[PDB]
Ligand binder design. Sequence first.
Ligand SMILES: O=C(c1ccc2c(c1)OCO2)N1CCCCCC1
Length: 149
Amino acid sequence: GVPTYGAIILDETLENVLLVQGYLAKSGWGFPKGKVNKEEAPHDCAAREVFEETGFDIKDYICKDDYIELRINDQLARLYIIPGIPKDTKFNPKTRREIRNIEWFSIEKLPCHRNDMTPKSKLGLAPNKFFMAIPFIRPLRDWLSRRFG
Ligand SMILES: O=C(c1ccc2c(c1)OCO2)N1CCCCCC1
């Protein structure tokens, strides 16, 4: 799989994160990110995808060492961590054929796993609208604990 790059944008209080909602196969909420172009550097791809999906330019704010990276079914996803972005910032996606909505969410209220169906004696997991975000939540909380306490 081709690697994806994007960002975790936090507000000034460090309580809230910015998620985007896609369409169809991507119909739920996730961090902004997308596939790298041939010859494109990781930091440039992250700024390009976040700008297409949110209208906000991160280029002057990226720190090269500050990111969370996960491998999900053999595709690598790297999200640069971007704190301190005010909640009154005006976000407007570029690619509105791909992005339904853009909203701030409370980090303490977001799930860090889906729920099972053991009350129904049935295997698998119940649907969750945060499915794309969920794998990053626990690693984010651990990262913020260490850097900020
Ligand atoms: O998370 C993604 C995404 C981007 C590229 C992908 C992908 C997922 O899976 C395989 O290639 N996006 C894109 C727009 C939808 C809302 C969330 C952000």
